[PDB]
Structure formats: structure tokens, C-alpha cells
Ligand binder design. Structure first.
Ligand SMILES: NC(=O)C1=CN([C@@H]2O[C@H](COP(=O)(O)OP(=O)(O)OC[C@H]3O[C@@H](n4cnc5c(N)ncnc54)[C@H](OP(=O)(O)O)[C@@H]3O)[C@@H](O)[C@H]2O)C=CC1
Ligand SMILES: CCCCCCCCCCCCCC(=O)SCCNC(=O)CCNC(=O)[C@@H](O)C(C)(C)COP(=O)(O)O
Ligand code: SF4
Ligand code: SF4
Ligand code: SF4
Lengths: 208, 112, 112, 340, 52, 96, 94, 156, 176
């Protein structure tokens, strides 16, 4: 029955909710909100100061042994004052479960490096600094990865144009590859695809 | 006596029961310093006391590993050491205290 | 507000002066290693111009982050991570001069 | 008729409004002229008489479609008509410092330019730019400059409103002027007629010449005017060659040679079937002091300030340095004495 | 991350090669250049994944 | 293949296996390039009754995540999930 | 496929380079690629089908290999019904 | 003229030597390199045609720009092209190399390798099939066969 | 569930020791590898004689884009621009105007074969089967501009390859 729709597993939902309450109780100082998605994923929202403490708690077995940092990334939502949402994805092989811890930052506010806790966050935090503008304090070596050696802007920032501000070409006069202002021969055609009609009534925001 | 733990970098412990007893006792000692009503202390003590009782009750390494469900006993001792370090850092962090600051008005609202 | 490295503007100015010293001494080594055809005075003038571009900053955190970016660029130049193309990009040799007077902009194009 | 409104911000993808046929673009000056034209966004039509491989270096200079290569023959007027048919500007840079069996100095500096100018006038091209050495004169010892003066007269005849640019020795990376002096190290001492004391030269940077040509195309007043392109400073040949060897960090051994002996040596090198290392005309032109022509307008009129030889010498002459002196800075060698 | 539109708001790809190349330095300690080539081979890094 | 018996014997002996039985090169065993036209089956939702999309609308059955704890307004210790069971050595070939 | 005054072959779109235009240089020693077959002429050549029903359906031929099926009203005597996709024309007899 | 005949025959010999022995350099940026390896694989072995991959730029004759050329990699590509002795030919493989392809509007992509280095043959596709790359290489060989360096020398 | 690679202990009996000593001193395993290489020497090579021999391809192959026509000769395109919309690389530029007949036809249809990723979209997306990636793969060019196709070029390709394109579509139309 209901072949198209995805099957739901309530057992995992209850287990994740219970463990989320467990974490919230153990560290009330930093955890602000814990929610479990209906696809059975647990998210704990933390104050920026609690990254190292909460991550160290999660890695060490207080009935939780998340000893693998799946990925670390940021989501830039310009509307929010803290435009960057730092996201940590952890994996516990002992309990075969994954949880996500999320924190916020601004362009000018540093966030502590997690290289001490996990040691896989060196390159992830460097990428976060390179694309987004977040600075991670006490990082062993914070420098650019994935961008050109002289790149000035921070891409992935929702302000940076997709094509950028500069372009590279070889110039015979200087016998060198020289940057120049971007001049697209075919401007990227912006398509307005959003429909005027609401698709999901469940997520309807309050009229306010 | 198992020839190898099977995981590189982890060595067979000749005296597993003694090591586990010492580590759990130290963890309980550190937990004692933590305030009584702190959830960390209550839960960690609950887990530790269960583990220590299991370790004392069972004299066989394989039976103890089956009972603990923490993998090979060397992994259990490693987890105990990790717990001890956490407990020690917890004392400094004092996570049991109230929330440092509530988030901005709509810092966790999605969709925007 | 949480300070990045400096709690007040004077400390950030001290860091900025240290960075300027580092670049000023590095400039001749850059000309030698990268086999650049610019003179040392020309490169140091470019360094001053880059420092002067952000001379309007009045917030300590912005100044600290700028010093961090400058230190990263200096590390790139001290190593050979940046090529001669990257070093000479600061001098926009290929780009033609862009008139700034109203009449020239009016003649050339529709740009404001 | 063929008028295009300029559009864009002057980049690679922009339309400058300049449609040009650069004759002799597969050469030292043609490369820079084509690069400057392409960067603006102008359409460049390149007539090439050589193999397409030799024109490959110019392919990246322009955006897609801007650079069109069409094979042309100097002797055949119809190819000139085909190349210049749709151009609003034509630049003639066809010149060989050495005479060849098929084409002598007369053909390259007189017949070719005259045919180009006549076909351009017939086609309707608005503007024509022609290049003739500053030292060009009908009574000059060198056949090269004599033919250059005759060609200037003929081009003015065929195209009355034609800009003629008279450049001095143009020093650049691919130059045959600084490299020529530097290459003399291989032969031991540097042979100089009278030791170079009696000769004064005013070299011009290649980039300055190309920018002057482009500004002349842009400038409305340039029509029917002869410009003289000369460098900021005048040097004695001895001082200039000594500075060349100093910047190259190669030992300098100047030895005076009689003019007839130098002419005989030039005849010896003319024998080479391939590009001659030097020619009697080359020796004569090198010895001839650069003329001073205050009447003609110069680079300053076109808005370009001439770059001094000191600034750009290292670019040309660093390659001639050995491993020991490859990394030496430009400032190590002081500027040469200037006869100004 | 989806904003309810037809286009994803954010897509972050976790490439296995990223962390392996990060650990390459730790793995290489105490080895020679050929050992470094072998270690690069062992972690099976395709740099399209690493750089994205 | 077209190998002579002598070459087949030499190759098989050198390999230590019978190469002829499993040949890397492909011969008449491959499927014919032209195939009979297919008749692909329809899916579960191809019905003329009792098929209202409201019943089978998966996307509209998604809901905003449930909030277990919110800061803005004995118990047994719990784990993220039941501890993983140890793997069992394969019967077919425990050791390679 | 008519030829313009310049000698260029005008495309089905009607595109031909004016004598003033400098872009004709691109074909100087190369050719301008023009499809001789013009859709308008060929669609005109097809005979008009006469059907005895007020509404008819055109699928473009070949069923699923053609175009979406559309129904055409043929009531108007003055003008033949034309398929939006195929371009074929139909009219009621008499 | 007898001189013209001698020049034409010597040019034929030189062009035959250069096209028969085409040594691409071991330069692969992106997914298109895999199709290049499959071209080197037994099915379409390029060694039959005389195309042998040689690592050193100075010992190579052709550069195949297989994969996207980022703004970071462009100076290295130009350096490798310059260090390659002449005659040197460049083949651009894949949409990414030809004009930027899927990442044309990216900040970190050069919209074509033609901007950095001159290109002789463009092989379309994303990824171009190994047969397509072999066709492009043979087309480059024919282009070399059509070269007239010595004839032009004689006529000049 | 899990298997142990390695994790085997050599026998210490004198015969096994002598065998391993012979392997070390007498290089047996290297000889086995040499024999494998020799056997490959005597196996038939897998090289195909391109261009004379061409590698297998299926009817669903995605190659050079082509614009098809109806059997009448009318162009199938109805200027939907949905095929432009679905193009992942924005390689299709379409402009349309009512034609003299009054039909919805494309004044401009351009596919940049240098921005195309040959995804196969717009063959699935296009409603009337107008745009099809045909069998051709050997359309290499000596200039970048040759690869910026035009409506005329695409229609010429469709006319050139219609015989093969129709047969392939017939082969795979039921699977779609
Ligand atoms: N210092 C200077 O450079 C000075 C410049 N000039 C003039 O300006 C130009 C500068 O060129 P330069 O920098 O010397 O480089 P080149 O000597 O390479 O210039 C010659 C150019 O014209 C072509 N060409 C040469 N001979 C013929 C011919 N017989 N028929 C057709 N085309 C021919 C060459 O192509 P190809 O190799 O295929 O023949 C090349 O593109 C020359 O015309 C020169 O006389 C004047 C005074 C000084
Ligand atoms: C080869 C040449 C390349 C040189 C490149 C050098 C660089 O990258 S410069 C980067 C460093 N930028 C800065 O330090 C910004 C400093 N910002 C400031 O606001 C300060 O300078 C202050 C506060 C204005 C004080 O400066 P002053 O003493 O007033 O002046
Ligand atoms: S063109 Fe296609 S196959 Fe080639 S590198 Fe780019 S994405 Fe990969
Ligand atoms: S199927 Fe092709 S021709 Fe027809 S409307 Fe769509 S893109 Fe245009
Ligand atoms: S197959 Fe070609 S035209 Fe169609 S969507 Fe892909 S890139 Fe665009």
C-alpha cells in the first residue's frame, strides 16, 4: 500500500528524540534547540561558544561516540543577522547513528576551530573560510583552498555573482596570464521559475 | 589471550579487568567533583556504575565483552579513558549552567 | 562584540604596522625571486597603495581580518605559491585607463 | 558606409567599432597591434602569406570571431581587395629588413604599400596607417630607407588622407635591434664602425608604437598627418651597446672596424638562404644616426608618454643573461649616458 | 537544503577524497618520494571530488 | 578465438588456466543488436478508480521537523540507537 | 531560397547581410550555411485533407512519434483548419 | 621548377615524420582524461598510429587539454605549453576545455582554453568518446600533412 | 558479513620452508608473472582498426544535436522554449516570431556545442521530437566558432542524418 510514498520508521524517530533530550539535559549551557526531522535526522542547535564543548561531549562516550566528522559546512542566509550557519555532521559507528549540530556566526565574529576535537576539520574549516567569510580561531593553518592564489572575494556567499568579478586570459604584450573585469559574451539568463501558487500548505508561514 | 585486537594501533591489554576497574573508579572520582544535580554526573555515574558492576561480576574477557556490548575489551578501555578526559574537561566547562544566550529573533527559522 | 585579535584600534594599528614592515622587507626578495621587472621602489609603492586603500577602516575587527588576509597573501608571496601572474596582477598593466571625468564617461558609454 | 557604433566597456567581448586589416600582422609590430586591437573588442582581419602555423600565436588575441585570417599575396591586388573590402581601417606593416629573391626592397616598401593604398581607396576604407622609418629619405645610403621614402610618397599619392607613422628602432622582446647587438657576443668582440661614438639613436618601445597606432586610429585629427615615433632619450651607439651588454651582464669588447670591412662582413652574411643575420643595409642603417624632425608630431600628441629604454631593457635582454645573472634586478645597472 | 522552490538553496558535497588527501601528510611521514606516489595511489583521490 | 592448438596450449600452460573457456574478446555470444520491440509495464498509479492523488501525494505528507527541546519557552541514560552488533566472519570464505 | 542584392543567400528566417554590414567578411573565403529546404513552401505544398466531421484530430503521424494530439474545428467554410503543430490543413467537404 | 619539387618532397617527408610520430604530453585535467586513457587502452590503442604519451613537456609534441581549465590551473598550462618545443600543436577535448561547458558561468573556470593557449583542433563532447578523440588526432595529422613550411620558404 | 584479507600464517614445516626458500632464491613468483605476460602475448589483440572499424553504439547514443522535420517537410519545432529551459548548461538560445503562414516557428535556434554537456535533455524535454542528439560523434572542428551551431546548421544536420535518426528513434521510442 502507498507504494509511491516513503515508508516511515517511528522507532528511529523516538530513539533520536530521546537522545536529543539526553544531550539537551547534559549540556543546557550551549544547546538552544533540538529537533528531529520526519526523515529521522537529529539536529541540535548550539550557541557559537559551545562548538568545542558540545563536540567533545559528542565524541566521548556519554552514551554517544560520534567519532567521525562526516562533513562541516556553512549555509549563508543573508536575511539573518548571523548570515552564516555552521553545520557539523557527525557519525557514531558504535551506535550506527548520525546527528547534526548547527551554530551561527557573523562576518566579523570568529568561531573556535574544531581541529583539536576531530582533526578532520582543518581542510573543512579552511574551505569554509575560503568560500564563506567565516574565520576559525586557533586554527593550525587557515589559508585558501579551492580558490585562486590571489582571489579576493569569498564565493558561495550569495552576494558573489556566479561569474565573479574577474576573468583570466593570456596577453602576448606582457607574456603573462592577466586578470581582467568579467565580460560575458552571453549573459547568464536568469529564469524566474517559482510558481505564484503555494505548493506545500504544511509549511505556510504565519501571515503576520 | 587474543593475538591481536584486529584494529591497527590498538594493542591487547594483558590485565583488562584491572585497567577497567581503575579507569571507572577514576571516572567516578572526577564525577564526584561535579555538582550533584548536573545531568552529566547523574547519567555518566549511571553508565559507569553499570559498567563497573559488569566488569567485577564477570571473570571472562569474552563474556564481559558480550555483556558490555562495547566491542573488544581494549576498545572499552579506550572509551573509558576518553570518558575520563571528557569528565575532566567538563569540570572546567561547567555545561550544567544555564544557556549562555538565547539566539537572535529568527536565527533558526527555515524557510526564510 | 568579541575581538578577533585586538580589543581596541591601537592594537590593530600595531598589528598593521607589523604587517607593513614584513611586506616592506619582503618586496626586494619578491622582485629577485619572481624575476619581476618592476623596481623595488615600485613594489613598495604598490604595497603602500594597497595599505592605503583600506585606510578608512575604523572598526578593530575589520582591521584584524584585513591583517589576517594580508598575512596570508604575504605567506603566499614568501613561498612561490603565487606565480608572477598573481604578483603582477596588483599592477593592472593590461587594463586600459578608465576616465573618471563626467564628460569622458558620457562620451564612452552609458555607464553611470 | 561601414560604420559601427561602439558598445560595451572596452573589454574582450565589447565592440570597439574598429574593423581593421593589419597587413604584416605576423611580425614584431603586428603582434602588439593585433593584441591592442583585440583587447578593445575590434574586429581584426589578418592577411597572411606564411604557413597558418606561424599565425597561431595571434589566434588567442581576440574573442570568438574577432580575428579572421585570410591568405593574401602582395603581388595580387585581388587578394588585397578581398582583405580590405569590409574594413573601416587598414594598417600596412609589411617590411623585410633583408631583400629576397622574389621580393626586393622596392616591392616590399614601394609596390606593396602603393597597391594596398590604391585598393583601399577604391574599396572605401576610411582610414589607412602606414609605417616608414624616421630615417627614411630618398638620398639615404641604405636602400631600405630610400624605398621607404619613395613608398611614403606613393602612399600619400594614392591615399591623400593617410596617417604615416615614422618610428625609430623599436626595442622589444622580439626586437631585432637589442637582440642584434646582444647576439654580437657570440662573435667575440662587438664590431662598431668608428666605435659607435659618431652615431646617435633614439629607440622607441614596441608597446608605445602600437598604442600610438591605436590612438591614431581613434584620433580624428590624425588623418593626413605624419607622426614621428621616437624614444625619450637619445644615446650614442657606443653607450647604448655598452648598456645592452651591461644589462645582459655579458662582457663588452668594443673594437673599431672600418666601414668597408663591415660592409664586406654584411655581404658575407647576406649569402645565407635563410633569414640573414646581418646585411650591408643593416650595417648602414645601424650606423646612420637617427634624424631629429621637430616639425612632425610625436607620441605626446597621441597621448602616450614614451617609456624609457631603462625601464624595459631587462625584459628584452634578460634571456641573453647567463644563469649567474638571470635573477639580477633591473636597478643594478645604472642608466647609460644620454646625448640630449 | 531546500527552501521549497524548484532549485536547491544549498548543496554541499562530502567527497571521500577530501579527508584522505588531508591525511596524506600524516600518512607520508617517514617515507620517500616513491612511497608518497604509492600513498597518493592508495587513497584513490579523484580531484573533481576533492575540489568540486 | 582463431588460435592454433599449439598456441592455445602454450598460452594455457603459461597462464596456468584454460584461457579458451573464458575469452576476453567477445564473439557470437553477444546479444543481437536488433531486438524485438518492448512492451514496458505501467506502474501502480495507472488505475481508473480509487486513484485520487490526495491518497498518494508523498510531498504533501512531509511535515516541518518536530521540536524535541526549545530554550525559548531517575531517568535512564539513553543512546542514539541500540549498540551495533558485531559482524560475523563470512562462512563462504572467512580468510582470503 | 532567394538571393539578396549583395549576392548572399537569404535564409528562411529572412536573414541577409546588408552591404553596409561589415559582418559579411566572415564568409569571405568561407560559405554561408543556408538550408535550401524551406518549411513554409513545403507546408504549403501539402494537399488539404477533406474530412466529413466537424472536429478532427491530428497527431502529426506516427502516433507517439508525432506531436501532441489536438482536435480541430472545421465549421468555418471560408478558412481551412490548420494544425497548430503539424501545419497540415483540413476542411469539410463542400 | 626542380627546386619547387625538391622543397615539396622534403616538406612531405618532414610532415610525414611529424604526423606519424605525435607524442602527446601526459596532461589530463578532468573527466575527459579518462576517455583519453581509454583511447590509450587496447581497443583504440593510439600507439598503433604513433601517438605515445610522454610526460616531459620538452619531449612532447602535442598538448591535449582534457578537462576544465580553472583560473588557478591556467598559468601552469601556459607554462607547460611554452616549455614545449616546437613544432607544437594543441588539441582541446571536451566542452569544458573548448568553451567552458557545464561550468561556463563559474568564477573559477576559464571559458575556453583558447583564451590561454592557441588551439588547433577542437573535439566536441562531454566527455568526447575515445573514438571522437582518435578522430580529432587523425584530423590534426591531416592538418600537419597539409602544412607547407618549406614551400612557403622557397616562395618567400 | 566480513572477510579477512591477509590474516594467514605460513606453515613452519621443513617442506614449506624449503618451498619459500626456493621462491626467494629461485624467483618463482616473478616467473609466474612472466608466464602471464607471455600468455597475453599469444592472445589475440583487442585493437579495432579505426577508422575502418568502428566501436559498438546503441540507438540511445547522444551525439551531435539535430533539428528534425515532419514527413511533410515542415520543421517540427513549435518554439516551446521548454527545451531551452531544461538545458543544464544554458547552451540553447531560442527566439521566435509568428511566421508568414502564422505558425509558431523559431527565428533563432542556436546550440553552443562548446557549452553543451550532451546530457540528452531537450530530447526528452522537447514535446514534438524536433531536437534530437543524433548518431554522429566525429564532428571535430579546427576553429571554436565552427562549434557554435546555428538553426541552419542544425537543420542541415537533421536533413543529413534523418535516415539514421528516424531508425534509432523507432528503435528506442517504445522505451521512452
Ligand atoms: N623598428 C621597427 O620595427 C620599424 C618598423 N617599421 C616598419 O613597420 C613594420 C614593422 O615590422 P617588424 O616589427 O620589423 O616585423 P616583420 O619584419 O616581421 O614585419 C613584416 C611583416 O609583413 C610580412 N611580410 C614581410 N615581407 C612580406 C612580403 N614581401 N609580402 C607580404 N608580406 C610580407 C611578414 O609576414 P611574413 O613573415 O609571413 O612575410 C610580417 O607579418 C615593417 O613594415 C617595417 O618596415 C619602420 C621603421 C622601424
Ligand atoms: C607586490 C605588491 C603586493 C602588495 C600587497 C600587500 C597587501 O596585500 S595589503 C593588505 C593589508 N591591509 C591592511 O592592513 C588594512 C589596514 N586597515 C586599516 O584600517 C588601518 O590601516 C588603519 C586603521 C587605517 C590604520 O592605518 P594608518 O596608520 O592610518 O595608515
Ligand atoms: S567536458 Fe564533461 S567529461 Fe569532460 S571534464 Fe568537463 S564535465 Fe567531465
Ligand atoms: S522541441 Fe526543440 S524545436 Fe520544438 S519547441 Fe522544443 S526546443 Fe524548440
Ligand atoms: S543535449 Fe545539448 S542541447 Fe540538449 S540539454 Fe544537453 S547540452 Fe543542451
Amino acid at each position: 500500500t502507498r507504494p509511491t510514498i516513503r515508508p516511515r520508521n517511528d522507532v528511529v524517530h523516538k530513539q533520536l528524540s530521546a537522545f536529543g533530550q539526553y544531550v539537551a539535559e547534559i549540556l543546557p549551557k550551549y544547546v538552544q534547540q533540538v529537533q528531529v526531522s520526519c526523515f529521522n535526522e537529529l539536529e541540535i542547535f548550539i550557541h557559537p561558544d559551545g562548538v568545542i564543548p558540545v563536540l567533545t561531549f559528542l565524541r566521548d562516550h556519554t552514551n554517544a561516540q560520534f567519532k567521525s566528522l562526516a562533513d562541516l559546512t556553512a549555509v549563508d542566509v543573508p536575511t539573518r543577522q548571523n548570515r552564516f550557519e555552521i553545520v557539523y555532521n557527525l557519525l557514531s559507528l558504535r551506535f550506527n547513528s548520525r546527528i547534526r549540530v548547527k551554530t551561527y556566526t557573523d562576518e566579523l565574529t570568529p568561531i573556535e576551530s574544531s581541529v583539536t576535537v576531530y582533526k578532520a576539520a582543518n581542510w573543512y574549516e579552511r574551505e569554509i573560510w575560503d568560500m564563506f567569510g567565516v574565520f576559525f580561531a586557533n586554527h593550525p593553518d587557515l589559508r585558501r583552498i579551492l580558490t585562486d592564489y590571489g582571489f579576493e572575494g569569498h564565493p558561495f556567499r550569495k552576494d558573489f555573482p556566479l561569474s565573479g568579478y574577474v576573468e583570466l586570459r593570456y596577453d602576448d604584450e606582457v607574456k603573462r596570464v592577466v586578470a581582467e573585469p568579467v565580460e560575458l559574451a552571453q549573459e547568464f539568463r536568469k529564469f524566474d521559475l517559482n510558481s505564484p501558487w503555494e505548493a506545500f500548505p504544511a509549511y505556510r508561514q504565519p501571515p503576520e | 589471550l587474543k593475538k591481536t585486537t584486529g584494529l591497527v594501533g590498538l594493542a591487547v591489554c594483558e590485565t583488562p579487568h584491572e585497567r577497567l576497574k581503575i579507569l571507572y573508579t577514576k571516572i567516578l572520582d572526577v564525577l564526584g567533583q561535579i555538582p550533584k544535580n548536573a545531568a552529566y554526573r547523574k547519567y555518566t555515574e549511571q553508565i559507569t556504575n553499570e559498567k563497573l558492576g559488569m566488569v567485577k561480576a564477570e571473570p571472562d574477557v569474552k563474556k564481559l565483552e558480550e555483556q558490555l556490548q562495547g566491542g573488544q575489551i581494549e576498545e572499552v578501555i579506550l572509551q573509558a579513558e576518553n570518558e575520563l578526559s571528557l569528565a575532566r574537561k567538563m569540570l572546567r566547562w561547567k555545561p550544567w549552567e544555564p544557556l549562555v544566550e538565547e539566539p537572535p529573533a529568527n536565527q533558526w527559522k527555515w524557510p526564510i | 562584540v568579541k575581538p578577533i585579535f585586538s580589543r581596541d584600534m591601537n592594537e590593530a594599528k600595531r598589528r598593521v604596522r607589523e604587517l607593513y614592515r614584513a611586506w616592506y622587507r619582503e618586496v626586494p626578495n619578491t622582485v629577485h625571486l619572481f624575476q619581476l621587472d618592476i623596481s623595488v621602489k615600485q613594489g613598495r609603492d604598490k604595497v603602500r597603495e594597497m595599505f592605503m586603500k583600506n585606510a578608512h577602516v575604523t572598526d578593530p575587527r575589520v582591521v584584524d581580518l584585513l591583517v589576517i588576509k594580508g598575512k596570508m597573501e604575504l605567506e603566499e608571496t614568501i613561498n612561490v605559491w603565487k606565480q608572477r601572474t598573481h604578483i603582477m596582477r596588483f599592477f593592472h598593466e593590461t587594463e586600459a585607463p578608465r576616465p573618471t571625468d563626467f564628460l569622458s564617461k558620457f562620451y564612452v558609454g552609458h555607464d553611470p | 558606409h561601414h560604420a559601427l557604433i561602439p558598445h560595451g566597456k572596452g573589454g574582450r567581448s565589447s565592440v570597439s567599432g574598429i574593423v581593421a586589416t593589419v597587413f604584416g600582422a605576423t611580425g614584431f609590430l603586428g603582434r602588439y597591434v593585433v593584441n591592442h586591437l583585440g583587447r578593445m573588442g575590434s574586429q581584426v582581419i589578418v592577411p597572411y602569406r606564411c604557413e597558418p602555423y606561424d599565425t597561431m600565436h595571434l589566434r588567442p588575441m581576440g574573442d570568438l570571431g574577432q580575428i579572421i585570417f585570410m591568405e593574401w599575396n602582395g603581388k595580387d591586388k585581388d587578394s588585397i581587395r578581398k582583405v580590405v573590402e569590409h574594413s573601416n581601417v587598414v594598417i600596412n606593416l609589411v617590411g623585410r629588413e633583408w631583400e629576397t629573391k622574389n621580393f626586393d626592397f622596392e616591392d616590399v616598401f614601394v609596390k606593396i604599400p602603393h597597391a594596398i593604398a590604391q585598393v583601399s581607396k577604391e574599396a572605401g576604407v576610411e582610414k589607412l596607417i602606414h609605417i616608414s622609418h624616421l630615417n627614411a629619405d630618398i638620398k639615404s645610403p641604405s636602400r631600405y630607407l630610400r624605398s621607404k621614402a619613395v613608398g611614403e610618397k606613393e602612399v600619400r599619392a594614392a591615399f591623400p588622407e593617410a596617417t604615416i607613422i615614422k618610428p625609430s628602432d623599436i626595442f622589444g622582446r622580439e626586437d631585432r635591434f637589442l637582440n642584434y647587438f646582444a647576439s654580437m657576443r657570440w662573435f667575440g668582440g662587438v664590431p662598431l664602425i668608428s666605435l659607435g661614438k659618431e652615431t646617435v639613436k633614439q629607440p622607441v618601445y614596441i608597446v608605445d608604437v602600437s598604442k600610438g597606432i591605436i590612438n591614431a586610429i581613434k584620433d580624428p585629427d590624425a588623418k593626413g598627418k605624419t607622426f614621428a615615433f621616437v624614444g625619450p632619450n637619445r644615446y650614442l651607439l657606443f653607450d647604448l651597446v655598452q648598456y645592452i651588454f651591461a644589462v645582459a651582464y655579458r662582457p663588452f669588447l668594443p673594437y673599431p672596424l672600418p666601414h668597408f670591412a663591415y660592409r664586406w662582413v654584411g655581404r658575407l652574411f647576406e649569402v645565407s638562404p635563410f633569414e640573414p643575420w646581418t646585411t650591408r643595409d643593416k650595417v648602414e642603417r645601424v650606423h646612420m644616426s637617427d634624424m631629429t624632425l621637430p616639425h612632425l608630431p610625436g607620441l605626446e600628441d597621441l597621448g602616450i608618454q614614451a617609456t624609457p629604454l631603462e625601464l624595459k631593457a631587462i625584459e628584452v635582454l634578460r634571456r641573453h643573461r647567463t644563469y649567474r645573472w638571470l635573477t639580477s634586478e633591473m636597478e643594478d645597472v645604472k642608466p647609460a649616458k644620454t646625448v640630449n | 537544503v531546500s527552501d521549497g522552490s524548484s532549485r536547491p538553496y544549498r548543496c554541499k558535497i562530502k567527497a571521500p577524497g577530501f579527508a584522505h588527501l588531508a591525511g596524506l601528510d600524516k600518512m607520508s611521514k617517514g617515507h620517500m618520494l616513491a612511497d608518497v606516489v604509492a600513498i597518493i595511489g592508495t587513497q584513490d583521490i579523484v580531484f573533481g571530488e576533492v575540489d568540486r | 578465438a582463431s588460435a592454433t592448438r599449439v598456441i592455445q596450449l602454450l598460452r594455457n600452460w603459461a597462464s596456468g588456466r584454460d584461457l579458451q573457456a573464458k575469452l576476453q574478446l567477445r564473439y557470437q555470444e553477444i546479444s543481437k543488436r536488433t531486438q524485438p520491440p518492448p512492451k514496458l509495464p505501467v506502474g501502480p498509479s495507472h488505475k481508473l478508480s480509487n486513484n485520487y492523488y490526495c491518497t498518494r501525494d508523498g510531498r504533501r505528507e512531509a511535515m516541518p521537523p518536530s521540536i524535541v527541546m526549545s530554550s525559548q519557552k531517575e531517568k535512564k541514560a539513553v543512546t542514539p540507537a541500540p549498540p551495533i552488533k558485531r559482524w560475523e566472519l563470512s562462512k563462504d570464505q572467512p580468510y582470503l | 531560397v532567394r538571393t539578396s542584392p549583395t549576392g548572399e543567400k537569404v535564409t528562411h528566417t529572412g536573414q541577409a547581410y546588408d552591404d553596409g554590414d561589415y559582418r559579411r567578411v566572415r564568409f569571405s573565403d568561407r560559405q554561408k550555411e543556408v538550408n535550401e529546404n524551406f518549411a513554409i513552401d513545403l507546408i504549403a505544398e501539402q494537399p488539404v485533407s477533406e474530412v466529413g466531421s466537424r472536429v478532427i484530430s491530428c497527431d502529426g503521424g506516427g502516433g507517439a512519434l508525432g506531436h501532441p494530439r489536438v482536435y480541430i474545428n472545421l465549421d468555418k467554410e471560408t478558412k481551412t483548419g490548420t494544425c497548430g503543430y503539424c501545419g497540415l490543413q483540413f476542411r469539410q467537404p463542400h | 621548377s626542380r627546386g619547387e619539387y625538391v622543397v615539396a618532397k622534403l616538406d612531405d617527408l618532414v610532415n610525414w615524420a611529424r604526423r606519424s610520430s605525435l607524442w602527446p604530453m601526459t596532461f589530463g585535467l578532468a573527466c575527459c582524461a579518462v576517455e583519453m586513457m581509454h583511447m590509450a587502452a587496447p581497443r583504440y590503442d593510439m600507439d598503433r598510429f604513433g601517438v605515445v604519451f610522454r610526460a616531459s613537456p620538452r619531449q612532447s609534441d602535442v598538448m591535449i587539454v582534457a578537462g576544465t581549465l580553472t583560473n588557478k590551473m591556467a598559468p601552469a598550462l601556459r607554462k607547460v605549453y611554452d616549455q614545449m618545443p616546437e613544432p607544437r600543436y594543441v588539441v582541446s577535448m571536451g566542452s569544458c576545455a573548448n568553451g567552458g561547458g557545464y561550468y561556463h558561468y563559474s568564477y573559477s573556470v576559464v571559458r575556453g582554453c583558447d583564451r590561454i593557449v592557441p588551439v588547433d583542433i577542437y573535439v566536441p563532447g562531454c566527455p568526447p568518446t575515445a573514438e571522437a578523440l582518435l578522430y580529432g588526432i587523425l584530423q590534426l595529422q591531416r592538418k600537419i600533412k597539409r602544412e607547407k613550411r618549406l614551400r612557403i620558404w622557397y616562395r618567400r | 558479513t566480513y572477510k579477512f584479507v591477509n590474516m594467514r600464517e605460513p606453515s613452519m614445516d621443513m617442506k614449506s620452508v624449503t618451498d619459500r626458500a626456493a621462491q626467494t632464491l629461485l624467483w618463482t613468483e616473478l616467473v609466474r608473472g612472466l608466464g602471464m605476460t607471455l600468455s597475453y602475448l599469444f592472445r589475440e589483440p583487442a585493437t579495432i582498426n579505426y577508422p575502418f572499424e568502428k566501436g559498438p553504439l546503441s540507438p540511445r547514443f547522444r551525439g551531435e544535436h539535430a533539428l528534425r522535420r515532419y514527413p511533410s517537410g515542415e520543421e517540427r519545432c513549435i518554439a516551446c522554449k521548454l527545451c531551452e529551459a531544461v538545458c543544464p548548461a544554458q547552451a540553447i538560445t531560442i527566439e521566435a516570431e509568428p511566421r508568414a503562414d502564422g505558425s509558431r516557428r523559431t527565428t533563432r535556434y542556436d546550440i553552443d556545442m562548446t557549452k553543451c554537456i550532451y546530457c540528452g535533455f531537450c530530447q526528452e524535454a522537447c514535446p514534438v521530437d524536433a531536437i534530437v542528439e543524433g548518431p554522429n560523434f566525429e564532428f571535430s572542428t579546427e576553429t571554436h566558432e565552427e562549434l557554435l551551431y546555428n538553426k541552419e546548421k542544425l537543420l542541415n544536420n537533421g536533413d543529413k542524418w534523418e535516415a539514421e535518426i528516424a531508425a534509432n528513434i523507432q528503435a528506442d521510442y517504445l522505451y521512452r
